[PDB]
Structures are given as structure tokens and as C-alpha cells.
């Protein structure tokens, strides 16, 4: 069972990761994780990808692909894998096909931008301790203040409404053609594609995956 899980930043597609992992007994894999696990290994690619990172240049599509083919070749991927957040472009996806890395399902965790914004800007945090809150779901006992210390709560620079919005616009701009690519690939029978609605409750989204997957 080989699955590609896609979704906008802050949509929360990771909320179904462990379900898929336990359902079909497969590891979760991201380009970020293997970038490190490669350097950790004495692999040539690891040493290669290490130099590119130390020099602060983007990792080439060919090198990332090589790391992927290397990653899924390991024994933990005997029954498949869960590929999280990759590919991100059509060249990358085609490069996976050019190297014969097919997948069974392409899942698109979909959440409207406005909802994502609403979720994120609602966050509050106690920076020095790292304690997190949220105006809904988990508000502090004393309004605007940390339960433990009683100090005023703040917000992350990474959660600024203006910052989050640019991230989404950028993401859609970069992912739009790729979604159509896999949807068309599905019409060609090369893989299966399904646009999952991530606005419903977790338990409901989970049950929808079982009808899509099996």
C-alpha cells in the first residue's frame, strides 16, 4: 500500500497519518526525514545531500528522487509507505514515474483557506515554557494569561494572519497543476485519486478513508 498524502500548510493532514500507518503497517516518510536519515547513513547520497545543505542551496529534484528510491528500498517499506508532502511539483512527480516509483493512492487533505487562517490565528502561547493554548478548544483559565505562571499570553511570529495567508496563496500557486496531474493520472488508471474533506471531525474523516482505501 503506497500512499501520497497532500494538503495545504496548516490544514492538518497529519491528523490521519498514524491511522493510515497502523491500518496498513507502513512507515511515514517526508523528504525532510530522509534528508537527515541519509546523512546519518554512510550513503553516497547522504554525503552528497549533506554538502548541498551546508552550502544552503536547494536540493535538486534528481537528488531528492534518488533519496526516495533509496528510502523505500529499505525493509521497513516492505508493505508500502506513506509519503507526506511530496511531490510538490509536476517535474518531481514525473521524475518519480521516470524512475518507476508508482503509488496506489493520492489523497488530497482539503481545508478552505479561511478555516485554516481561523484555526491558526486563534493560537496563544506561553513562550518561556512553550505551553500552548487556543481561544477555542483549549482556552486559559484566566483570560489572556498562562495557567501556571499567570503571565500574559502571546502569539507566534509564524502564526501571523498576514504570514499564513501568503503561505497558502504560495502553496496553491505551486500545487494547483500537480493536483490536476494526479487527477488526470487517475483517469488514466495509473493511480487512484481522492479529494478528502478535512473540515469534518477526525473520526468522520477516518471513516471516509476506509471507504476510499479499503
Residue numbers in the entry: 1 to 214
Please share excerpts from the published article on this structure:
The Pro177 to Ala (P177A) mutation was chosen because proline at position 177 is conserved in AdK11 and introduces a kink in helix 9 whose importance in the enzyme's opening/closing dynamics has been demonstrated by all-atom molecular dynamics (MD) simulations. The apo and holo structures of both variant enzymes are very similar to that of the wild type with only minor differences in the conformations of their AMPbd and ATPlid domains. Analysis of the Cα displacements in the X-ray structures of the apo- and Ap5a-bound states compared with wild-type AdK of the two AdK variants revealed that the displacements of the apo states were significantly more variable than those of the Ap5a-bound states. That is to say, the apo states are more conformationally heterogeneous. NMR chemical shift perturbation analysis also indicated that the conformations of the apo states differed more than those of the Ap5a-bound states, showing that the apo states exhibit greater structural heterogeneity both in solution and in the crystals. While no similarly pronounced change in the rate constant was observed for the P177A variant, this mutation is significant because subsequent analyses showed that both, this amino-acid replacement and the Y171W variant, redistribute the native energy landscape of AdK (see the section kcat versus kM and kcat versus KD compensation). To assess the accuracy of these measurements, we also determined the diffusion coefficients of the P177A mutant, which were almost identical to those of the wild type.
AdK catalysis, which plays a vital role in cellular energy homeostasis by catalysing the reversible magnesium-dependent formation of ADP from AMP and ATP10, is dependent on distinct ATP- and AMP-binding subdomains (ATPlid and AMPbd). The turnover rate of AdK is limited by product release, and it has been shown that the microscopic step accountable for this slow release is the re-opening of the substrate-binding subdomains. AdK populates two main structural ground states: an open substrate-free state and a closed Ap5a-bound state. The ground state structures of the P177A and Y171W variants in their apo- and Ap5a-bound states were determined by X-ray crystallography.
